[PDB]
C-alpha cells in the first residue's frame, strides 16, 4: 500500500537522476574536448549511468514482488511502471555516456 | 471500439505528459541559473495538472468499460494504458512543481 | 523481440542526434543576431533536422507494427516510447533550425 507508493517515488527519483546523467553525457559529447581529463570525465558518466541502471533493475525486481503480493493493485502496477521507466532512462543515459567516452578517446 | 478509442486517448495523454516533463525539467535546470520565469513555470504546472486529471478520468472511464465488457482483453488494455498515462502525468506534475518552487 | 531492442536503440540514437542538432541550431540562431550566421549552414541544419524527423516517423510506424505483433510486450512498448521521444526531439530540432534559417536570411 504505502510501500508501493514509496517504491514509486524512489523509482521516479532514480529516473530524474538518469535524465540528469544523460544531459551531462550529451554536453560532454558536444564539447569534444579530447585528452585524459575529458576521457576520465566521460568514464565517470559511464560509471554513474551503469550504477543507475542496476539500481533501477533492483527496484523493478522489488516492484514485481510487490505486484504479485498485492495481486495487481494499481498502486503496485504504477510502481512497477515507474521502475521500468527509470531503467529505460538510465540505460539511455549509459548509451549516451558510451558515445561521449568513445568520442573522447 | 470505445475500448480502442480509450486506449488511443490514453496513449496521447501519456505522450503529452512525456513532453511536459521535459519542458518542466528544462525549466527546473534553468531555475538553478537564476533566470527562470515563475509565470512560465506556473503554466507548465497548470498543464501538467490538467493532464493528470484527464488521465484519472480516463482511468475511471476505462474501469467502467472493463466491468461492462466482463474483462475483455481490449478493455483490460485500455485500462492499463490509462494507468500508465496517469503515472506519466503525475511524474510530469512533480517535475513542474519543482520547477515552479525553484523559480520562486 | 530482438527487433524491438534494435528499434529502441535506433530511436535512442535518433533522439540523441536530434538534441545535438538542436544545440547546433540554437548557436546558429544566436549567431544570426550578431549577423555572423551563414545562410548555407542554417539551411544545412534544417535539412539534417528534417531527415531526423523523417527517420522518426519511420521508427514510430515500425514500432507500431511491432507493438501489434508482439501484443504489448514491454520491449515493444519501450521501442514505441523511444520512437515517440525521437519524434519530438527531431521536431524541436527542426523548429529551431527554421528560426535560425529565417533569421540568417
Author numbering:
A (entry chain A), C (entry chain C): 0 to 104
B (entry chain B): 1 to 104
The authors write:
We set out to design proteins that can switch between two well-defined and fully structured conformations. We reasoned that these goals could be collectively achieved with a “hinge”-like design in which two rigid domains move relative to each other while remaining individually folded. The hinge amplifies small local structural and chemical changes to achieve large global changes while the chemical environment for most residues remains similar throughout the conformational change, avoiding the need for global unfolding. Designing one of the resulting conformations to bind to a target effector couples the conformational equilibrium with target binding.
To explore whether peptide-responsive hinges could be turned into protein-responsive hinges, we used inpainting with RoseTTAFold to add two additional helices to a validated effector peptide, resulting in fully structured 3-helix bundles (3hb). For nine of our validated hinges we designed and experimentally characterized these effector proteins using SEC. Hinge-3hb binding was tested qualitatively by SEC and, for hinges which had a corresponding FRET construct, quantitatively with the FRET-labeled variant, and DEER was used in addition to FRET to confirm that 3hb binding caused the same conformational change as effector peptide binding. For two designs, 3hb05 and 3hb12, we obtained crystal structures that agreed well with the design models, indicating that the three-helix bundles are fully structured in isolation. The affinity of 3hb05 to cs074F was similar to the affinity observed for the original peptide cs074B, whereas 3hb21 bound its target hinge cs221F significantly tighter than the original peptide cs221B. The 3hb approach was able to rescue designs for which the peptide alone or the hinge-peptide complex had shown the tendency to form higher-order oligomers.
